[PDB]
Amino acid sequence: DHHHHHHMKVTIPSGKRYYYAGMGITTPGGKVDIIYTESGWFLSDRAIGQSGIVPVGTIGQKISQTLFPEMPTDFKQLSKLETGIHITDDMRGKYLTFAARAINSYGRVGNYQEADRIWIMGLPVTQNVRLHTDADLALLKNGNTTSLIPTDNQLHTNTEVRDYFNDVVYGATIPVLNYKEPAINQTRQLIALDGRTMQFSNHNFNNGYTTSVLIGNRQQTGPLLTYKLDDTLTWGINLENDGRIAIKTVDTTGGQEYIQNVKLDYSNDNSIQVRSAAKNGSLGIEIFINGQSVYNKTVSLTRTTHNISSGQIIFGGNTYINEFAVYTESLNNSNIQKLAEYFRDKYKAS
Ligand SMILES: [Ca+2]
Ligand code: NA
Ligand code: NA
Ligand code: NA
């Protein structure tokens, strides 16, 4: 007396490990290769059950304490068909999966076998994205093999971090940590530059730009975000330990002032968004902290004329960055608020 195991290949040919909403994406269809099968598409809840816990993104596969949704109890059936799924806004921050199960001669239903899972990015505004990095998707890299970052609250420099919008691997050394956050009873990741920088070149600051950043709930200091407008003119945001924010303009051919009435509470996460565009030969800059617009000033380009057509965006400091996006648009108020709401609720279960 013995038992045979029979095989199924369950895939999404050409499918990716993540997609954005708001971009007109429809996934490729699923495929099952084999007595009978039942297949379909499933979408996770926003609370992973036993007070459910919030799901967090990955493009890797299960050292790590991250909790991932379990099939089938943490999922709802989206389709009984195999054809591809049109991504909708309601799917953001959830896992989408194609799965199939075998049924035997006696009607007995096996366990679901999944294709590679799809994380639907939380980012609610995709128009004009130039760079997008979610620290939760960073992986550990040893040689050419990647794996999940261990939940040890240590800065690892053997990492792989991308601009996920264009699917480009960053070459800079980017330390990342993974830790269990008690406020959410779930892990998350933070880019921890520790004084290093991430330097992005060829940015035309005459045109509309928005840089949106979510920083973590730890004390931080240093030059979180700097715009190197040209070879001699620089504008930057500097964090202090007390939570005050210093804005500095340096013209090596400026000034320094604190944002008025602003004290970041590092007990919480905080979002900082900067929108800018040139007008009348000066660069106008507006800063939103947690969705409120605290600072709205202009930087003179003539006081000798500064050509800001090929500047740099530089992240730095002793900071903890959970997510950032750079847009080649000065986003309107509605979109600034959509981003602020997303950043506030990224780790809220529901
Ligand atoms: Ca089987
Ligand atoms: Na994401
Ligand atoms: Na590691
Ligand atoms: Na729910």
Residue numbers in the entry: 2 to 35, 46 to 61, 64 to 75, 80 to 270, 275 to 324, 327 to 373
From the reporting publication:
Type 4 pili (T4P)—important in bacterial pathogens—are filaments composed of one well-characterized major pilin, and several minor pilins whose roles are often poorly understood. Streptococcus sanguinis T4P are composed of five pilins, which makes it a good model to determine the role of each pilin subunit in detail. PilE1/PilE2 are the major pilins forming the backbone of the filament, while the three minor pilins (PilA, PilB, and PilC) form a tip-located complex promoting adhesion to various host receptors. Here, we characterize PilA and PilC, showing how they interact and how they function.
To confirm the prediction that PilC might be a modular pilin, we solved its 3D structure by X-ray crystallography. After optimizing the best diffracting crystals and using SeMet protein for phase determination, we solved a high-resolution structure at 1.45 Å. Strikingly, while bioinformatics only predicted that the C terminus of PilC corresponds to a lectin domain, our structure reveals two distinct modules. The first module adopts an Ig-like fold (PilCIg), consisting of two β-sheets packed against each other. The second module that corresponds to the lectin (PilClectin), is a β-sandwich characterized by two opposing antiparallel β-sheets of six strands, with concave and convex sides. PilClectin shows significant structural similarity to multiple carbohydrate-binding proteins, including galectins such as human Gal-7 (PDB 2 GAL). In the Gal-7 structure, the protein interacts with galactose via a carbohydrate-recognition domain (CRD) forming a patch on the concave side of the protein. Since the two proteins share good structural homology in that region, we speculate that the CRD might be on the concave side of PilClectin. When we compared our two PilC structures, we found that they are essentially identical, superposing onto each other with an rmsd of only 0.79 Å. We then purified these mutant proteins and quantified their affinity for 3′-SL using ITC, before comparing it with WT PilC. This revealed that PilCT347A and PilCK349A displayed significantly reduced affinity for 3′-SL, which was particularly pronounced for PilCK349A, with 39.3 ± 1.4% of the WT binding.
